[PDB]
Amino acid sequence: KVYDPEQRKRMITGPQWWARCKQMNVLDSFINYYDSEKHAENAVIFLHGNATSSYLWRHVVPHIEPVARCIIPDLIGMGKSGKSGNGSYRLLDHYKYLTAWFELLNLPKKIIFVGHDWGAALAFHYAYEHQDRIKAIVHMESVVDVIESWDEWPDIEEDIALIKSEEGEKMVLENNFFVETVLPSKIMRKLEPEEFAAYLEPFKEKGEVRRPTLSWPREIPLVKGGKPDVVQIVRNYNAYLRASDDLPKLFIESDPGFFSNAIVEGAKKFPNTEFVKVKGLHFLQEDAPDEMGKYIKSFVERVLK
Structure with a gap:
C-alpha cells in the first residue's frame, strides 16, 4: 500500500468536504449531507455503509452531477450527522431517520439509489416498501441476500462470532476496529493522512x-445466528428484487473485492442487472472512483433516455 503520486494534488480533506455540505433537522436529530442541487427532475441518492460516511463518495459524485441531482447523506450517528435519539443504530433505526429525511428533500416520484454495504441494505429495503418510487438501483459489496453458509466468503466467521459477543464492545468502542483495522486493510492504496483523519x-x-x-x-442476516427481524427484512427485499424485471439495476463488482465473490451470484438473480467490474477491496471508491463514476453516469444516462 503506497500513495497515489497525483492524489495530494486533488485531495478533498474532510473539512473541505464538510464545508460543501449542509444540515437538515430530521425528527429529533439531524442529517449532514452533500447535495449537487441542479438537474432535480431526477435524484441520485448515494448511501455509504459501515465505517464510513458521505466523504466516501467525494470523487465519484462529480461524474454524475451533470446528468442528475446527486444527494449524499451522512447516516445518523455517522459523518457529521446528529445522534440517534434513543442511542440505538440498527438498520431500522437508520431507516427511520433516512425515510423521514427524504420527505424533506423534494424528490421526484422515481428515485435513483446508489448503495454500498449496508447503504445497499437500506436502499433495498426502501425499494421494497416503496416499489413505485424507484427508477434504478446501483449496488456494490452489498447485502444482497441472507447468508446460508460461509463458503464463498472471506475468513471473517470468527470476527463475526466475536463481534456478536461481548468482545465486540472492546473491538469497536475501545479499539475502533472498523476505522483503524478494517478500513485501511480494505483499501488497496494508502490513504492520505488528511483523508484517513x-x-x-x-x-x-x-x-x-x-x-x-x-x-x-x-445486523448481519445469518440464517443460523442472525437477528431474525433483519433476516426477514433481507429475505423480503431479496424476493422482491428477484421478481423486479422492469427495474434497471447496476452491479459494480470489486476485483478482487472483499465479498464481491460471495455475493455476485446473488446479484445475478436480480434481473435487469448490468454488470461492470473495477479494482478494489471492500471500499472501492478509494481505488477506482472515476472508473466508478463513469460506469454510473453511463447507466444513469441510459436510464433517463
Whole structure:
C-alpha cells in the first residue's frame, strides 16, 4: 500500500468536504449531507455503509452531477450527522431517520439509489416498501441476500462470532476496529493522512460514540445466528428484487473485492442487472472512483433516455 503520486494534488480533506455540505433537522436529530442541487427532475441518492460516511463518495459524485441531482447523506450517528435519539443504530433505526429525511428533500416520484454495504441494505429495503418510487438501483459489496453458509466468503466467521459477543464492545468502542483495522486493510492504496483523519474524526473519541460501527455488523442476516427481524427484512427485499424485471439495476463488482465473490451470484438473480467490474477491496471508491463514476453516469444516462 503506497500513495497515489497525483492524489495530494486533488485531495478533498474532510473539512473541505464538510464545508460543501449542509444540515437538515430530521425528527429529533439531524442529517449532514452533500447535495449537487441542479438537474432535480431526477435524484441520485448515494448511501455509504459501515465505517464510513458521505466523504466516501467525494470523487465519484462529480461524474454524475451533470446528468442528475446527486444527494449524499451522512447516516445518523455517522459523518457529521446528529445522534440517534434513543442511542440505538440498527438498520431500522437508520431507516427511520433516512425515510423521514427524504420527505424533506423534494424528490421526484422515481428515485435513483446508489448503495454500498449496508447503504445497499437500506436502499433495498426502501425499494421494497416503496416499489413505485424507484427508477434504478446501483449496488456494490452489498447485502444482497441472507447468508446460508460461509463458503464463498472471506475468513471473517470468527470476527463475526466475536463481534456478536461481548468482545465486540472492546473491538469497536475501545479499539475502533472498523476505522483503524478494517478500513485501511480494505483499501488497496494508502490513504492520505488528511483523508484517513476525516474517517477517524467522527469516531476519534473512545466509547459509545463508536456504537454505529458495532451495531451494523450485528445486523448481519445469518440464517443460523442472525437477528431474525433483519433476516426477514433481507429475505423480503431479496424476493422482491428477484421478481423486479422492469427495474434497471447496476452491479459494480470489486476485483478482487472483499465479498464481491460471495455475493455476485446473488446479484445475478436480480434481473435487469448490468454488470461492470473495477479494482478494489471492500471500499472501492478509494481505488477506482472515476472508473466508478463513469460506469454510473453511463447507466444513469441510459436510464433517463
